Design a protein around this nucleic acid. Structure first.
Length: 134
RNA sequence: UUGAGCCUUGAUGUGUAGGAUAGGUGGGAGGCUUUGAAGUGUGGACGCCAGUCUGCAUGGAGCCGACCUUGAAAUACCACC
């Protein structure tokens, strides 16, 4: 279950703490500490009834340095999440892609949908923790 | 004593693919691993009783998912769950 590596990375930072977005882009480098090149994803929990097709969320936004583009679509449960780029990019380069996807996520709220949009959104890498960001 | 709600988290569901009791989206060719390891074993749990899960030493440092066969994943792993 628990290995020699996930003791460090899952607990080097506190995933239960809501970090700032400006702090998050530098702390994901610790979460992306690996031999290969990972990809950081923003995980947004949306409680829509995705079986009702009128509440579906779908779109894509722009990346300023290619890959290139980023595409997002929800599952059949309602949780919608996608990447923002590679982790070899600079923290200020992942600054640009994170808010552009986030604002377009706020733009695509359905008319009949209700409730609070963001609860515990997390920057999730390929193998790092789901660090709580706001 | 007995209901209801909360958390870092252990497990959780063969028609048919197939080694396998896959519920999905998200990620990439790396994890697991000399931070004590594969397979056995059993207290206990285990089902649609085809067969599996939790703790470890005597054991002793090895095991895996591409593609392909599939309506689709074939947990090595992480994350939302």
């Amino acid at each position: 279950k628990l290995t020699k590596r996930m003791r460090v990375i899952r607990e080097k930072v506190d995933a239960t703490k809501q970090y700032d977005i400006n702090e998050a882009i530098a702390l994901l480098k610790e979460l992306a500490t690996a031999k290969f090149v990972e990809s950081v994803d923003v995980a947004v929990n949306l409680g829509i009834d995705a079986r009702k097709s009128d509440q579906n969320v779908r779109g894509a936004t722009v990346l300023p340095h290619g890959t290139g583009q980023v595409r997002y679509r929800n599952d059949k449960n309602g949780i919608i999440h996608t990447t923002i780029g590679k982790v070899d990019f600079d923290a200020d380069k992942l600054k640009e892609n994170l808010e552009a996807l986030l604002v377009a996520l706020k733009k695509a709220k359905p008319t009949q949908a209700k409730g609070v949009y963001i609860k515990k959104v997390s920057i999730s890498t390929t193998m790092g923790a789901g660090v709580a960001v706001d």
